[PDB]
């Protein structure tokens, strides 16, 4: 394999997400570049993430996360259970993005993850439209009643009828029939897709998991979902990570399958155990139909070699190396 794992607290999906971000090489390098200053890594999320990444890249033994979880404050089962995985992703990404504000690696995070969409609500019978353009760093895909990810995307951009009791509140126009919908303008180099298998059911008053089968491909063409395609850069996406959950409301187990280089050589990361596996273990075996994927990472075929550029010892600033080496000395005696 050539890759090292993470130690297993009740941190659930974190290790899975941490490996996922570590192997986003371009992000890893920018996190290395981010200027930071501190004697303890637990003293900020940027420091702690720099440390975790440094150790994943250099240790031969499983890497600890105590100082990382201390730095962002999620130290109980309940703090992970109250959040979706992208909320933790945002917590880490947003902080690091704001740490890069006015630095040499400024804008790295939106460059890698941010796409553009536009939502609209058009009234049928009156002249009112509420066209709102917004930016995204991840996409929450509905899987209920969807056999595969193409149907998720179809349902995502489907026009919703606001009619009957759903009649749009058009303010001074009163209740109005209208047509809701969203359009993709761009798709980012690195595409985070949550599969919304976990949801609160208000009918039964319970959190539930949907274990139905839901297929996703090695290569994901998304040109059909763009408002305007680019003939020079078809939106073909290459599957990078499959974040997997096993279990029910009484316990569960999280692993991530990752092909770090985007070549197809897949390795399963199960906390401290990292092992080469087959493409079938990574993909089809996680289709479900209680162990299945709840989040995927895809990378644009055209950006693959930039996003997954090698990150050598040379790409880590000496000031950081020295900070981490001093910390390791103080932790050794």
């Amino acid at each position: 394999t050539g890759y090292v794992g993470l130690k297993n607290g009740a941190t659930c999906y974190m290790n899975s997400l941490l490996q996922t971000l570590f192997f986003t090489n371009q992000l890893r390098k920018a996190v290395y570049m981010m200027p930071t200053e501190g004697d303890d890594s637990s003293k900020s999320v940027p420091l702690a993430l720099q440390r975790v990444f440094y150790e994943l890249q250099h240790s031969d033994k499983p890497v600890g996360t105590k100082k990382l979880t201390k730095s962002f404050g999620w130290e109980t089962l309940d703090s992970f259970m109250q959040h979706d995985v992208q909320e933790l992703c945002r917590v880490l990404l947003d902080n690091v993005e704001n740490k890069m504000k006015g630095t040499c690696v400024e804008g790295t995070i939106p460059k890698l993850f941010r796409g553009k969409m536009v939502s609209y609500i058009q009234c049928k019978e009156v002249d009112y439209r509420s066209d709102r353009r917004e930016d995204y760093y991840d996409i929450q895909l509905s899987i209920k009643g969807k056999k595969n990810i193409f149907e998720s995307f179809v349902d995502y951009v489907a026009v919703e009828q606001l009619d009957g009791d759903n009649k749009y509140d058009a303010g001074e126009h009163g209740l109005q029939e209208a047509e809701k919908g969203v359009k993709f303008l761009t798709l980012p180099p690195v595409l985070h897709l949550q599969l919304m298998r976990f949801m609160y059911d208000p009918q039964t008053d319970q959190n539930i998991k949907i274990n139905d089968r839901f297929e996703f491909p090695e290569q994901l063409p998304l040109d059909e979902f763009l408002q305007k395609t680019d003939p020079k850069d078809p939106a073909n996406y290459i599957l990078h990570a499959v974040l997997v959950h096993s279990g029910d409301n009484h316990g569960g187990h999280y692993v991530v399958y990752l092909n770090p280089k985007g070549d197809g050589k897949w390795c399963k990361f199960d906390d401290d155990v990292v092992s080469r596996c087959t493409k079938e273990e990574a993909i089809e075996h996680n289709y479900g139909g209680c162990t299945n994927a709840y989040m995927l990472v895809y990378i644009r075929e055209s950006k693959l070699s930039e996003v997954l550029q090698a990150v050598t010892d040379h790409d880590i600033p000496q000031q950081l190396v020295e900070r981490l080496q001093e910390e390791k000395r103080i932790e050794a005696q």
């Binding site: 999906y13 259970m81 409301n249």
Partner: peptide, 15 residues
Amino acid sequence: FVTXGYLXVSXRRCG
């Protein structure tokens, strides 16, 4: 807004 439990759901999806 449930007693946890090992199924994570955002509280922003619980109202």
